[PDB]
Coordinates of C-alpha atoms and ligand atoms in Angstrom, one line a residue:
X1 CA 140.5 -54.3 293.1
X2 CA 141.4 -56.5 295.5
X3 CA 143.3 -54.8 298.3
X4 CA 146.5 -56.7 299.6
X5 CA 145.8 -56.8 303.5
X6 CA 149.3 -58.2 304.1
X7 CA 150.7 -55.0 303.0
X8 CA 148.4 -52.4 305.3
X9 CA 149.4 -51.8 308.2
X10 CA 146.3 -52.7 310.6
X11 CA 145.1 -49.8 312.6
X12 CA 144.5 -47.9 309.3
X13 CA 141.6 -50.5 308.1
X14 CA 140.7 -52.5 311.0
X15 CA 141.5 -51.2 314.1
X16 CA 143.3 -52.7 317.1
X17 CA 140.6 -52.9 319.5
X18 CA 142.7 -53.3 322.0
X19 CA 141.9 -53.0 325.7
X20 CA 145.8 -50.6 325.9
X21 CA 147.6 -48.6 323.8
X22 CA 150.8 -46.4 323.7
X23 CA 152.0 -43.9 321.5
X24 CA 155.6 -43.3 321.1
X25 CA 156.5 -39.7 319.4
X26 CA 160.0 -39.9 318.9
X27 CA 163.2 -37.5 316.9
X28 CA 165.4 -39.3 314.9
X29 CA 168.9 -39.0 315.7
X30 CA 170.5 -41.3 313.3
X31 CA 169.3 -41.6 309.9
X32 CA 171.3 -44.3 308.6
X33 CA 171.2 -46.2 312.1
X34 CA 167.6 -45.9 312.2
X35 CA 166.7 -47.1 308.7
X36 CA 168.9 -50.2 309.6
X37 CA 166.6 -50.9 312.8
X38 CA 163.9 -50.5 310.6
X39 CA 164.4 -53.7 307.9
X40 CA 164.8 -55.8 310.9
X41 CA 162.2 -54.5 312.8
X42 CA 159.0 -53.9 310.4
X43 CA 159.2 -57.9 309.3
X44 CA 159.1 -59.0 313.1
X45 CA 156.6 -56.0 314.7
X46 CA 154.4 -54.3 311.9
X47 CA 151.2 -55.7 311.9
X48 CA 148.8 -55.8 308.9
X49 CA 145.0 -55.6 308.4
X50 CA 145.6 -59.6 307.5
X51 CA 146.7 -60.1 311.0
X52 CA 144.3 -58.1 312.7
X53 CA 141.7 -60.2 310.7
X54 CA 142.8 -63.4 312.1
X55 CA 141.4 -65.4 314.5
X56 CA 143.2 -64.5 317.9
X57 CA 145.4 -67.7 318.5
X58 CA 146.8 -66.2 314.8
X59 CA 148.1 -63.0 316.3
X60 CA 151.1 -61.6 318.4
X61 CA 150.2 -59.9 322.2
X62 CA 150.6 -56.4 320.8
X63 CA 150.4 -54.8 317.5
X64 CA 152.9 -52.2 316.4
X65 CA 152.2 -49.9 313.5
X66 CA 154.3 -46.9 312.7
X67 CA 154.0 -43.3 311.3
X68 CA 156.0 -40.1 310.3
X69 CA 155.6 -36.5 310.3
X70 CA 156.7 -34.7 307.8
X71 CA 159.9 -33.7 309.2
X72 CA 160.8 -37.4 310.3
X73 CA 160.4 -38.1 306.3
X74 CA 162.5 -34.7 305.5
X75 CA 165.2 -36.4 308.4
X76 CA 165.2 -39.8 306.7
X77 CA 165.8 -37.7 303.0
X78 CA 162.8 -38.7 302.2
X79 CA 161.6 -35.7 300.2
X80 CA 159.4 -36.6 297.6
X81 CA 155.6 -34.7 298.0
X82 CA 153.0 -36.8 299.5
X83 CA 150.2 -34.5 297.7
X84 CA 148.3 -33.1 300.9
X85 CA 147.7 -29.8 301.9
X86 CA 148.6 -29.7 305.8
X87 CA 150.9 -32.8 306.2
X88 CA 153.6 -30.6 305.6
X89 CA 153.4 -27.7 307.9
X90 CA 152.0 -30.0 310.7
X91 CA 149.2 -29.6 313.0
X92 CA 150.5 -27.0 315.0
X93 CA 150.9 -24.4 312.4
X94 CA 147.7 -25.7 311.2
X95 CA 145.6 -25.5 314.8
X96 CA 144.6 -22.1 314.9
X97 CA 142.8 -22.9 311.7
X98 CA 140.8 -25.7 313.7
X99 CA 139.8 -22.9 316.8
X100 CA 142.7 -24.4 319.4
X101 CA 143.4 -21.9 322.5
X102 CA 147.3 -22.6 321.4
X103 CA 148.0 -21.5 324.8
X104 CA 146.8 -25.1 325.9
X105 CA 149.8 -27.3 323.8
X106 CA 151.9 -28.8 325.1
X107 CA 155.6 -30.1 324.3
X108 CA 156.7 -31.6 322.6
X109 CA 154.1 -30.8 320.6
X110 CA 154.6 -26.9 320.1
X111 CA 156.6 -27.3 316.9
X112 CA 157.6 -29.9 314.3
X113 CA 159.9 -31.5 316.5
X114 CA 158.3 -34.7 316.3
X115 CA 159.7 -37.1 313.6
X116 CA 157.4 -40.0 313.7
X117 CA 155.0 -42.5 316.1
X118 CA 154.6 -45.8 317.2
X119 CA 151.2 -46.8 318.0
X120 CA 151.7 -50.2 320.2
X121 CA 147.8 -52.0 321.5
X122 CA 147.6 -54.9 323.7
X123 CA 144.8 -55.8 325.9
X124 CA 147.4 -56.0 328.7
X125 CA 149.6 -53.5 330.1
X126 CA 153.1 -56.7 330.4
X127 CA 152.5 -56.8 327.0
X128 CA 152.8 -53.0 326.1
X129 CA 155.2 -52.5 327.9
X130 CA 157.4 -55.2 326.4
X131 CA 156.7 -54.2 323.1
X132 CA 157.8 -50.7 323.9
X133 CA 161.0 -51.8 325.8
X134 CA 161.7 -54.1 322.3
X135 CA 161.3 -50.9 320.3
X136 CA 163.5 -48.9 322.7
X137 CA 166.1 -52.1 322.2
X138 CA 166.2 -52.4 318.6
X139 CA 166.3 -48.6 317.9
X140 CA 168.7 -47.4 320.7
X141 CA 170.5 -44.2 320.4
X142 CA 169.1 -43.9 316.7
X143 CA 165.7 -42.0 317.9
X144 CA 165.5 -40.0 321.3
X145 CA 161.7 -40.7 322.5
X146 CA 160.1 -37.1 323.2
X147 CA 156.8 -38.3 324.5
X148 CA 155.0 -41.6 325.6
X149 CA 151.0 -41.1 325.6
X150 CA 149.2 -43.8 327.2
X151 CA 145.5 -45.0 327.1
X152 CA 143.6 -47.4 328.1
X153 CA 139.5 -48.8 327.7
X154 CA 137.2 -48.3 330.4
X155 CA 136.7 -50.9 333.0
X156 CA 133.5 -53.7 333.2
X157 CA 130.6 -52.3 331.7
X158 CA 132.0 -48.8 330.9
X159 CA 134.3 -50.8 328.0
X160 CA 134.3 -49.2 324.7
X161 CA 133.0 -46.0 326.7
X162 CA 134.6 -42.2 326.4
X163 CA 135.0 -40.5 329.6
X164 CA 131.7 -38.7 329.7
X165 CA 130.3 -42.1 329.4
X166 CA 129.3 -42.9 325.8
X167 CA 130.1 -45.9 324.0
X168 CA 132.6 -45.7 320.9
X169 CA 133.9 -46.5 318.0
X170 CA 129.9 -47.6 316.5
X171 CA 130.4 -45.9 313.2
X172 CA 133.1 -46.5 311.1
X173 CA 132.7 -46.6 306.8
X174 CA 133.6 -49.7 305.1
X175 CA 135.6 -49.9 302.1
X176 CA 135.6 -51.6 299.1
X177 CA 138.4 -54.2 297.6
X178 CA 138.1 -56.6 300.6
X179 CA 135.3 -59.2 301.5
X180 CA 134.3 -57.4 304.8
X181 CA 131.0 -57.3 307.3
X182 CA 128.7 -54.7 306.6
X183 CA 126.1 -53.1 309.1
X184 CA 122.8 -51.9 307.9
X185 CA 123.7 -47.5 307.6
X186 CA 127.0 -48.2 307.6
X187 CA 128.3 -46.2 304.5
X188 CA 130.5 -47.9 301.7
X189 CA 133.3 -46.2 300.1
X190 CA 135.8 -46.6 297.2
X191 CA 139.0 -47.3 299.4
X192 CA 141.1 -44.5 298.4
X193 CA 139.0 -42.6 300.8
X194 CA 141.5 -44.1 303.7
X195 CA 144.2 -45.7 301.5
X196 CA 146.1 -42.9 299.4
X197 CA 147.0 -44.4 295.9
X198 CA 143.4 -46.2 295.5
X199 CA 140.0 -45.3 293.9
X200 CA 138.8 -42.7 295.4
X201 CA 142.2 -40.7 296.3
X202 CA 142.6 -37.4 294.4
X203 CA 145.6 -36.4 295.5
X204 CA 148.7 -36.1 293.6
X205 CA 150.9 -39.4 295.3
X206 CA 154.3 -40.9 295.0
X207 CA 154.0 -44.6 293.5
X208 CA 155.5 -45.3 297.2
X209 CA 152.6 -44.2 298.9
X210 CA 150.2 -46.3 297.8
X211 CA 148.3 -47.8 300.4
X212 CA 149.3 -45.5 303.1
X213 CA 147.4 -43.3 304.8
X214 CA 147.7 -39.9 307.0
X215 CA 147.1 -40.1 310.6
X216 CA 145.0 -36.8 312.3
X217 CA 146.0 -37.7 316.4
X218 CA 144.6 -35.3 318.7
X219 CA 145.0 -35.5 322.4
X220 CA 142.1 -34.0 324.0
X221 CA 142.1 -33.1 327.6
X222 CA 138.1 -33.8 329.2
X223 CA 136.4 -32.0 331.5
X224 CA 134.1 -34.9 332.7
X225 CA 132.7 -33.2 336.3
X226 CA 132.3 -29.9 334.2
X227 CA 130.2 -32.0 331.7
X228 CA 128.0 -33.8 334.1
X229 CA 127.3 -30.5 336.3
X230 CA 126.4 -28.7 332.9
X231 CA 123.6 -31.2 331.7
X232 CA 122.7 -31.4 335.8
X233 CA 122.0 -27.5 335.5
X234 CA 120.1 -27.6 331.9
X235 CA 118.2 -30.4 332.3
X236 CA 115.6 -30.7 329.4
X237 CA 112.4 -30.6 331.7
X238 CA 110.2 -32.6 329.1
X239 CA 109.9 -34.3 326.2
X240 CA 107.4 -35.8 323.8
X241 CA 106.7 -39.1 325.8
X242 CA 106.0 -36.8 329.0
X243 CA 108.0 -35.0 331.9
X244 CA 111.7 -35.9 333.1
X245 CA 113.5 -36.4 336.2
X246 CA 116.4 -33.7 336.6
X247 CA 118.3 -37.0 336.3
X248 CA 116.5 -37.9 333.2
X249 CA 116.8 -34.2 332.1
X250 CA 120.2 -34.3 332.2
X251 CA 121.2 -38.0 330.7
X252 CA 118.7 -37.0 328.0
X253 CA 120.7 -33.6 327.3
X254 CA 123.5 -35.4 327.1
X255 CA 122.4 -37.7 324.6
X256 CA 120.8 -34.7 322.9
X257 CA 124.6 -33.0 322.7
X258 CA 125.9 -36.1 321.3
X259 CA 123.5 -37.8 319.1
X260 CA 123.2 -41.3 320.8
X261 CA 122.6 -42.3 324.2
X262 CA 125.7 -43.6 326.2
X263 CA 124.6 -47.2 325.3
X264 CA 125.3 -46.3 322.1
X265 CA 121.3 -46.0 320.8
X266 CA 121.0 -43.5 318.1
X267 CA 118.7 -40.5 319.3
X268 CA 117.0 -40.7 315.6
X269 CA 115.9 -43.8 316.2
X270 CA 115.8 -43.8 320.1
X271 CA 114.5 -40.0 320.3
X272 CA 112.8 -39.9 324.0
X273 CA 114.5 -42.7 326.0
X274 CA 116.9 -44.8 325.7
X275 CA 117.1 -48.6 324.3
X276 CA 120.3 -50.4 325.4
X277 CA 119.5 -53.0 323.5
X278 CA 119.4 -51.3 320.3
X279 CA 122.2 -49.9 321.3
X280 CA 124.3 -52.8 321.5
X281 CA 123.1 -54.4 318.2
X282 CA 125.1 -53.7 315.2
X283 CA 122.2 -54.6 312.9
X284 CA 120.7 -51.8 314.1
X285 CA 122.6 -48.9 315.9
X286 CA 123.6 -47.6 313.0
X287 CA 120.6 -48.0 310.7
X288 CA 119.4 -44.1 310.3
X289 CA 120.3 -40.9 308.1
X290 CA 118.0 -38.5 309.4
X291 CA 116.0 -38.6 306.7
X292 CA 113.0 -38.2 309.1
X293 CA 114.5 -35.6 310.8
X294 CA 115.8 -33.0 307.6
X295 CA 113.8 -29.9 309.0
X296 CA 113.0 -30.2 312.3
X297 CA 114.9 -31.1 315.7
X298 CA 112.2 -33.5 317.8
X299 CA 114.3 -36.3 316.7
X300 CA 117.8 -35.1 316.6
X301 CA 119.3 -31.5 316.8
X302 CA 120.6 -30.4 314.1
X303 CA 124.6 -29.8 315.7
X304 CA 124.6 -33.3 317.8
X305 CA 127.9 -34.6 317.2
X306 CA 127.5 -37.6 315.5
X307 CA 125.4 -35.8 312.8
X308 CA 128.0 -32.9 312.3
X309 CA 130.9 -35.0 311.9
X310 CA 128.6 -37.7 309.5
X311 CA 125.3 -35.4 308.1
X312 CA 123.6 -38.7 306.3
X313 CA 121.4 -37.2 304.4
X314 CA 121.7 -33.7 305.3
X315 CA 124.3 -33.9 302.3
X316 CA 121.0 -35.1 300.1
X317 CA 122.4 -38.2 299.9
X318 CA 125.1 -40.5 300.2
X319 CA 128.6 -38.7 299.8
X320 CA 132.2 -40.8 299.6
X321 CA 134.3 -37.6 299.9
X322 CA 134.0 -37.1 304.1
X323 CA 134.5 -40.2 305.5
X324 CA 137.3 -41.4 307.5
X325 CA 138.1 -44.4 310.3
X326 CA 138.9 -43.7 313.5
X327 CA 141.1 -45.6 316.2
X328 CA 140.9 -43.0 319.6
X329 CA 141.4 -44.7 322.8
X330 CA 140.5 -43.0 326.4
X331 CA 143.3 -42.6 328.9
X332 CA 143.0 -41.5 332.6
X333 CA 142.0 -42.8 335.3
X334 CA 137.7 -43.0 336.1
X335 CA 136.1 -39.7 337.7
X336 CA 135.4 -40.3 341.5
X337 CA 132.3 -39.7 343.3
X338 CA 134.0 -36.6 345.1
X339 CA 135.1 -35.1 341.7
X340 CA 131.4 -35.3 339.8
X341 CA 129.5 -33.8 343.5
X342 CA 132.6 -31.0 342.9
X343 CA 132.0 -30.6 339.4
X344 CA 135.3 -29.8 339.0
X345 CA 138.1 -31.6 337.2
X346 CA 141.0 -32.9 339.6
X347 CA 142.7 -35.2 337.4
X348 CA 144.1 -35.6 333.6
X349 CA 141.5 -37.5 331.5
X350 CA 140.5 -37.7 328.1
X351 CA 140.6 -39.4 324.4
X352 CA 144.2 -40.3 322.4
X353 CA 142.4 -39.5 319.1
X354 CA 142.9 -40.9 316.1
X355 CA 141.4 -40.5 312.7
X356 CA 142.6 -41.9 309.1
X357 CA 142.1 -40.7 305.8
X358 CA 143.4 -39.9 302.5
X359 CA 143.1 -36.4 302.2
X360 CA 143.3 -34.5 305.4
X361 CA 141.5 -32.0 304.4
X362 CA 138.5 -33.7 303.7
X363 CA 138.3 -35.8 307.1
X364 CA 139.2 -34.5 310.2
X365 CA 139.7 -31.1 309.0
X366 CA 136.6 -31.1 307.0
X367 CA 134.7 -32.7 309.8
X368 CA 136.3 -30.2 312.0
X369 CA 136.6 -26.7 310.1
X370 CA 133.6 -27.2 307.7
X371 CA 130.8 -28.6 310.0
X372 CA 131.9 -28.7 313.7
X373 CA 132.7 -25.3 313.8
X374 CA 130.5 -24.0 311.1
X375 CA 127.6 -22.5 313.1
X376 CA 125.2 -22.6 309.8
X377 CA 126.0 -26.2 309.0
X378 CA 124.2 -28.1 308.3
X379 CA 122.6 -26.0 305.5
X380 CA 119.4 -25.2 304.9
X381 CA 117.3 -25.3 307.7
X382 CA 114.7 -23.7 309.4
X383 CA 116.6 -23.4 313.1
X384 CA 120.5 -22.0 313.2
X385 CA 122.7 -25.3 313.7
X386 CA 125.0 -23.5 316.0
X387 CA 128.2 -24.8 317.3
X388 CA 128.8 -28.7 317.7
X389 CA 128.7 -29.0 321.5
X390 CA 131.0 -31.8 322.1
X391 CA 134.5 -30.7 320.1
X392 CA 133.0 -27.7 318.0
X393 CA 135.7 -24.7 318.5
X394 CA 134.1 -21.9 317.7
X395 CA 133.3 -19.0 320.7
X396 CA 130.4 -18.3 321.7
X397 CA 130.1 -21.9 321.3
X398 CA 126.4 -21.5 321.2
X399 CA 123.9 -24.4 319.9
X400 CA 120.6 -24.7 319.1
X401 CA 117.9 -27.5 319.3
X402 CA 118.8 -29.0 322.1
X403 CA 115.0 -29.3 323.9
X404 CA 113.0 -31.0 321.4
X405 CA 110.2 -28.8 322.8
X406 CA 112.1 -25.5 322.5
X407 CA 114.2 -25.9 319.6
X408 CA 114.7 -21.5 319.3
X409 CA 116.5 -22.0 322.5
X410 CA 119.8 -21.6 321.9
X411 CA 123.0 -23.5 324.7
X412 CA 125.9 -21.8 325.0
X413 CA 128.0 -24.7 326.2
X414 CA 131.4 -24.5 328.2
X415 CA 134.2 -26.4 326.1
X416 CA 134.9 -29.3 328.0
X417 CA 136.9 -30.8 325.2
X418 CA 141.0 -29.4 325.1
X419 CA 143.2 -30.0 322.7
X420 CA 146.6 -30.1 324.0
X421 CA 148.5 -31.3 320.8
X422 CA 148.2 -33.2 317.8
X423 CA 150.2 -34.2 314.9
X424 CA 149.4 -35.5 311.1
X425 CA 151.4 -38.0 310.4
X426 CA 151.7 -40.5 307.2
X427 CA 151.7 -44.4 307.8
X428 CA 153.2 -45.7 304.8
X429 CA 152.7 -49.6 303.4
X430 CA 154.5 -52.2 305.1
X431 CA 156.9 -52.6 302.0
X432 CA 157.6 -48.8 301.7
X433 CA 158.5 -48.8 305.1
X434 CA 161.7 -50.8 304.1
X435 CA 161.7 -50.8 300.4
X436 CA 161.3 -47.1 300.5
X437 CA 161.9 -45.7 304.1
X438 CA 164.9 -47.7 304.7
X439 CA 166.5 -48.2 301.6
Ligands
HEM501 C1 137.2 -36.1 323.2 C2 136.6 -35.8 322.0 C3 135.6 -36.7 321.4 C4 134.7 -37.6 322.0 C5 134.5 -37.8 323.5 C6 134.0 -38.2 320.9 C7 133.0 -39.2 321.1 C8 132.2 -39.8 320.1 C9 131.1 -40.7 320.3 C10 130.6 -41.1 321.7 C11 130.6 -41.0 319.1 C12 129.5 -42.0 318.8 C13 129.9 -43.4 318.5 C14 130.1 -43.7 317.1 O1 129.3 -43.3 316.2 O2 131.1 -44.3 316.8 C15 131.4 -40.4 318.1 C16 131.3 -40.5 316.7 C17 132.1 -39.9 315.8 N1 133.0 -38.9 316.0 FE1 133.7 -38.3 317.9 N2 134.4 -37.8 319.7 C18 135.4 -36.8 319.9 C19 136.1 -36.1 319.0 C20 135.9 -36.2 317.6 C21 136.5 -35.3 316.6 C22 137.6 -34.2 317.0 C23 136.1 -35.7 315.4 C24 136.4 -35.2 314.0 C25 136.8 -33.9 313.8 C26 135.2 -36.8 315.6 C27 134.5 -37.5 314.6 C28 133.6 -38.5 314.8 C29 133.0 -39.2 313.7 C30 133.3 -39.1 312.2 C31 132.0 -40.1 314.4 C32 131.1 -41.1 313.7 C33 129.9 -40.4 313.1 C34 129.0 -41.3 312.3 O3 129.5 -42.0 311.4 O4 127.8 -41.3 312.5 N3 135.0 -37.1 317.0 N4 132.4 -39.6 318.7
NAG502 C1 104.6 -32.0 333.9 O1 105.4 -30.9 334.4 C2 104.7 -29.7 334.6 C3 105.6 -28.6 335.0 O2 106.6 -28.3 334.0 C4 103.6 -29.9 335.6 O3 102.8 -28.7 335.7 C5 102.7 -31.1 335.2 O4 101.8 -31.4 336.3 C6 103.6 -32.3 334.9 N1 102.7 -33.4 334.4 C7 102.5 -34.5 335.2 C8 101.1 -34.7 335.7 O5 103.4 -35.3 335.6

């Protein structure tokens, strides 16, 4: 198969990588009005995979891609079934089921209000903000914009960082049908793992839908003084190569919580100090799958993050079905010397998360329901996983294996991780969104 990359829109496959980004959940107020702003808008603004692989003189300053919830396809009479299990009911109805405290949504995500998103990246805030005026231009008085979330990479060194401080965005699968860069670890997947329609997809689709994809956003609150104070207070006291700092103790736990070090150096390979450089080589930050590491925690715990949401060979080998591509950005502003000494949170911070598949159910949900919260997931080991520590949403929220020397001591870790909304949405083809969208 050779995928047509002209005809994907680009976040789904490649990623923006931009420096900003914007999302734009709007309510369509005017079917007919809107579907007429569409075929003159998705030509000019909807930017493929093929774009996103060009060189950078070949591209525009932002990149627009666009998705819809289902009841922005219902408002469009757009009724046909997509073939997934939650898109429908929305992620709302559908967050209980992933352990949310619901009393921490917000609007206008309480509901299915929400008809659809623009996802605008630019590395320069100008440039966003054009791009979002140009959408607010073309569409008009056809969509009423109900929210505008806003994010934005960290600054110097700290780019490509989350807010607790670890680099992103390392591990992503690679997909078959394109002639694509592939890192040593990095898994490869029939395509219709990400792109509904394609080998791989089992889901019952519309013709129309091939080469879409369904959007899981999540935006996550962080509680980044709360964090830092909590590996400050467990500091592992020692490891194999000898005795740590408190400060050592505590960057150490971290990485233990997450699976890599903030530079991005995967603990399995990196297990008792860090290696920046290792971290920032793609040839070989991603080459493990803790196959030297299946039954005992010295080199990894068993419920670190990374190896919840991607086991390796904890599955027994490798496995197409889980995988899914992720596009989260961090917004807020960066945590002060006065808030980390406090330990306490005094302003909004966190991850716009984003994470694309073909089957909800078997990405971020899976990833989610299945391992993160899944207290004896991994299976079959000798020590209780416990509770992934970072977004695992299960109370207690209790994990065990964090001190390589203790690994029957079981954390219970505060969440410092809130969800406070989310939405699955389907990002159709560029030529459904105005052969079939707005037709
Ligand atoms: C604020 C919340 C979150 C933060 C701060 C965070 C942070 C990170 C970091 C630092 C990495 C390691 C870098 C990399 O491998 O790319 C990572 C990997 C990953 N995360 Fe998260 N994450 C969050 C939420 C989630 C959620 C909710 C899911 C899915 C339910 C998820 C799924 C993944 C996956 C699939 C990987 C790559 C694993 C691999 O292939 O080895 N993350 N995340
Ligand atoms: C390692 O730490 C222990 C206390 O946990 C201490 O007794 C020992 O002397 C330390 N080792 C050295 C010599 O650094």
């Amino acid at each position: 198969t050779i995928l047509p990359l002209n005809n994907i829109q680009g976040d789904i496959l490649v990623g923006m990588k931009k420096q900003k980004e914007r999302f734009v959940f709007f309510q369509v107020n005017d079917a007919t009005s809107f579907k007429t702003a569409l075929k003159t808008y998705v030509p000019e603004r909807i930017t493929s995979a093929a774009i996103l692989i060009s060189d950078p003189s070949q591209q525009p300053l932002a990149f627009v891609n666009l998705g819809f919830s289902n009841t922005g396809l219902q408002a469009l009479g757009i009724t046909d079934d997509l073939g997934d299990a939650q898109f429908p009911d929305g992620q709302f109805a559908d967050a209980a089921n992933l352990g949310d405290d619901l009393s921490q949504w917000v609007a206008p995500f309480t509901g299915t209000t929400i008809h659809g998103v623009f996802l605008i990246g630019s590395d320069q805030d100008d440039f966003l903000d054009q791009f979002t005026d140009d959408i607010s231009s073309t569409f008009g008085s056809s969509i009423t914009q109900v929210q505008a979330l806003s994010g934005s990479a960290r600054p110097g060194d700290q780019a490509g960082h989350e807010h607790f401080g670890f680099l992103n965005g390392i591990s992503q699968p690679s997909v078959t049908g394109w002639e694509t860069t592939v890192f040593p670890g990095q898994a490869v997947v029939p395509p219709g793992i990400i792109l509904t329609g394609r080998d791989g997809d089992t889901g019952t689709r519309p013709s129309w839908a091939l080469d879409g994809s369904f959007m899981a956003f999540r935006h996550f609150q962080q509680k980044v003084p709360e964090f830092n104070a909590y590996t400050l207070a467990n500091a592992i006291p020692a490891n194999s190569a000898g005795n740590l700092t408190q400060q050592e103790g505590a960057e150490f736990l971290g990485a233990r919580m997450f699976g890599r070090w903030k530079s991005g150096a995967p603990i399995d390979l990196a297990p008792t100090a860090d290696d920046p450089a290792l971290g920032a080589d793609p040839q070989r930050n991603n080459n493990f799958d803790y196959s030297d590491t299946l039954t005992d925690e010295t080199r990894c715990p068993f419920g670190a993050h990374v190896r919840k949401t991607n086991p390796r060979q904890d599955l027994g080998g490798p496995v197409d079905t889980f995988h899914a591509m992720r596009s989260s950005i961090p917004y807020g502003p960066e945590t002060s010397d006065a808030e980390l000494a406090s330990g306490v949170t005094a302003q909004d911070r966190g991850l716009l998360f984003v994470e694309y598949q073909s089957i909800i159910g078997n990405g971020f949900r899976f990833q989610q329901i299945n391992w993160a919260n899944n207290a004896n997931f991994p299976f079959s080991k000798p020590i209780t996983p416990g509770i992934e520590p970072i977004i695992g949403q299960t109370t207690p929220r209790t994990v065990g294996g964090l001190d390589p020397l203790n690994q029957n001591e079981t954390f219970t870790v505060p969440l410092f991780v809130i969800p406070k909304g989310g939405e699955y949405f389907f990002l159709p083809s560029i030529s459904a969104l105005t052969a079939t969208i707005a037709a």
